[PDB]
């Protein structure tokens, strides 16, 4: 939905409420989104590095 990012998508059990669209954890990092066509609570996780 216009928000671009690279990571791995995992099904999340976070309990959103019918007016949020995307959550975050801390320091302004989009941590979970809701897909427009299914209304599903996903989970963004950065790809492995080190």
């Amino acid at each position: 939905n216009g928000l671009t990012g690279t990571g791995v998508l995992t099904e999340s059990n976070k309990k959103f409420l019918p007016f949020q669209q995307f959550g975050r954890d801390i320091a302004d990092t989009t941590d979970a989104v809701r897909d427009p066509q299914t209304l599903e609570i996903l989970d963004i996780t950065p790809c492995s590095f080190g």
Binding site: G5, T6, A27, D28, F49, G50
Partner: protein
């Protein structure tokens, strides 16, 4: 600074070799920490062991000797101390020496000083009955050794009472280990502000670089990315300098601790 962007990396390329210096400084800090631990704790070669039978002239060291029941073989006081006190491009590296090895060094040192006296700090450990060692220490401070051999029972009794009292005081009053907690809090706060600084415009149109890439024409995207780059680089430099100062102070403290262990544990000062 860049977060895996080709354009940002290319722009940062023409800013000289700052990052090699920063990484070198941080690696030096890490190696220095490892050396501090090694030189403050690794002071003996043989790993001495206490005898199975414990008759130390009436003294009772059970509170301090390792307990085989627990897996870590940590003493009661060590367990109390341990219980008392609690990605975006940053990593934490594990220490070289694990906690069990440190506990093993402490146990070896304590067994050596509890059986052989101070002799094990110079050559090879030579056994000595504990009462005779205490008599030697009284002779050292300026009291004839008659006093110990005539008041051994009372001396042992009040020694045990004192050790129990310090155990109880440590257990009850939580506010006992302030310095370590202060160090941990300072480090955590520095990391927190460093990671929070990433959410600033620095005069640009947005605080996120991906939107700038995906929204705007390169020719002025260089300008916006330059603003972001200079701000983040300045913040990183400040953080590195603060870390260097704190590490130097910690090194001074570690040197003092090593001297204290060498002078007061291995001998009577």
């Amino acid at each position: 600074i860049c977060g895996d962007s080709t354009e940002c990396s290319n722009l940062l390329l023409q800013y000289g070799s700052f990052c090699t210096q920063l990484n070198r400084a941080l690696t030096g800090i890490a190696v220095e920490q490892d050396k501090n631990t090694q030189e403050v704790f690794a002071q003996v070669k043989q790993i001495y062991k206490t005898p199975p039978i414990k008759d130390f002239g009436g003294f009772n060291f059970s509170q301090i000797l390792p307990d085989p029941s627990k897996p870590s073989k940590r003493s009661f006081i060590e367990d109390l101390l341990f219980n008392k006190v609690t990605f975006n491009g940053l990593t934490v590296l594990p220490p070289l020496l694990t906690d069990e090895m440190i506990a093993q060094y402490t146990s070896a040192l304590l067994a050596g000083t509890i059986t052989s006296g101070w002799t094990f700090g110079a050559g090879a450990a030579l056994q000595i009955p504990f009462a005779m060692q205490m008599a030697y220490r009284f002779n050292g401070i300026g009291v004839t050794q008659n006093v110990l051999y005539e008041n051994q029972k009372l001396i042992a009794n009040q020694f045990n009472s004192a050790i129990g009292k310090i155990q109880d005081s440590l257990s009850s009053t939580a506010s006992a280990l302030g310095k370590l907690q202060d160090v941990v809090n300072q480090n955590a706060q520095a990391l927190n502000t460093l990671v929070k600084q990433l959410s600033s415009n620095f005069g640009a149109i947005s605080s996120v670089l991906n939107d700038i890439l995906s929204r705007l024409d390169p020719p002025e995207a260089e300008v916006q990315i330059d603003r972001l780059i200079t701000g983040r680089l300045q913040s990183l430099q400040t953080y590195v300098t603060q870390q260097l100062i704190r590490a130097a102070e910690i090194r001074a403290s570690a040197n003092l601790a090593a001297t204290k262990m060498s002078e007061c544990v291995l001998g009577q000062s």
